[PDB]
Amino acid sequence: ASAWPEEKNYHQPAILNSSALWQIAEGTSISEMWQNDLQPLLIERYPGSPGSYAARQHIMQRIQRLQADWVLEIDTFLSQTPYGYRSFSNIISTLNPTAKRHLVLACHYDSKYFSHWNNRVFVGATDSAVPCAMMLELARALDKKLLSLKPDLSLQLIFFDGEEAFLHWSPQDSLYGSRHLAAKMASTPHPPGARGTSQLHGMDLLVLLDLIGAPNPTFPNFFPNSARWFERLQAIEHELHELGLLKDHSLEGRYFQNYSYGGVIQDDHIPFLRRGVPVLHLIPSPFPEVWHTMDDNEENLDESTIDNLNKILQVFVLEYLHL
Ligand SMILES: [Zn+2]
């Protein structure tokens, strides 16, 4: 039996030089993302709501206008909830569907349900409207390079529905979309016609973005089997910084620090991690101060920090895909 599922263990990045880094920093526009990808998502969008629908259409429309050969799938399913049976819909955007391996970027597009309080509405700006916009901006910004993909390795984006609990977190009330998708992918032969390999074996790495957008985030290196990739994020941040390609940024206050975090954090990566998928969890610790508060809004977002992370992530993806 082919040993292709092991290729991910030996995969190395094709590192960009100074000139290329300058080009990537120049190619991303934080103001464009702000107006075209983020603001339309800053609305109430808990599962089943009109906003969930509007968000899903926004995300799909923005991917569909790109030149790259994105194949969009809406994975809709039912699940029991504290409010009875309900419908959910994950959004999966895939380049080269039959491609055996894919680097996967992900986040959740639902917003935690909260009844309006004193005319305030919860829109989860950092949680996770920004991660959503960041993935859209990356697809747009790297569009020309991704188009060239039209190593049997390509890219995939997942926007999970129902990451949030309807009440407070519990094993059964939360991670609706990811628990469902992880199970579906684990039982789907891949590539097509395969005898004993699944879509999960095809996942080179799950890079999950969550709670991004607040000032001074510090991301810990959570897992040893993705530690070398965390290292690459550190190196990229360091080099972009040294080249003067980051804004209001210092090494003392770097985002990717030299520290681990032993505990467990409940999030969409769990169902994948427990089935063996390598995970690079881009969630900060501590969480943003506005976490699950009506203040997790646009006003409290740190623009230059988001801009800096767009450059780091875009460089990471290009290097991973050898583009
Ligand atoms: Zn949340």
How would you briefly describe this protein structure?
By secondary structure, the chain is α/β, with parallel strands linked by helices. The chain has helices at 7-10, 18-27, 30-38, 50-64, 125-141, 143-147, 176-186, 227-242, 270-273, 303-321, and strands spanning 71-79, 86-94, 101-108, 153-160, 203-209, 279-282.
CATH structural architecture: 3-Layer(aba) Sandwich
- The number of distinct structural domains comes to 1
**Major sheet, described briefly?**
6 strands, mixed
Counting H and I runs of at least 4 residues, what is the number of helices? 10
Full CATH superfamily name:
Zn peptidases
Number of strands: 6
PDB class: transferase
Keywords: alpha-beta protein, metalloprotein, transferase
Assembly: monomeric
Entry title: Crystal structure of the genetic mutant R54W of human glutaminyl cyclase
Structural account:
- Belongs to the glutaminyl-peptide cyclotransferase family.
- The active site is at 163 (proton acceptor), 210 (proton acceptor).
- InterPro entries: M28_QC, Peptidase_M28, QC/QCL.
- It catalyses: N-terminal L-glutaminyl-[peptide] = N-terminal 5-oxo-L-prolyl-[peptide] + NH4(+).
- GO terms for molecular function: glutaminyl-peptide cyclotransferase activity; zinc ion binding.
- The protein has ten helices and six strands.
- A hairpin with a 6-residue loop joins β1 and β2.
- The chain has helices at 7-10, 18-27, 30-38, 50-64, 125-141, 143-147, 176-186, 227-242, 270-273, 303-321; strands spanning 71-79, 86-94, 101-108, 153-160, 203-209, 279-282.
- α3 crosses α5 (125-141).
- The protein has one domain (1-323): Aminopeptidase.
- It has 323 residues and is of the alpha/beta class.
- The chain has a six-stranded mixed beta sheet with strand order 1-2-4-3-5-6, sandwiched between helices.
- Bound molecules: zinc ion (ZN).
- Zinc ion binds at residues 112, 127, 164, 292.
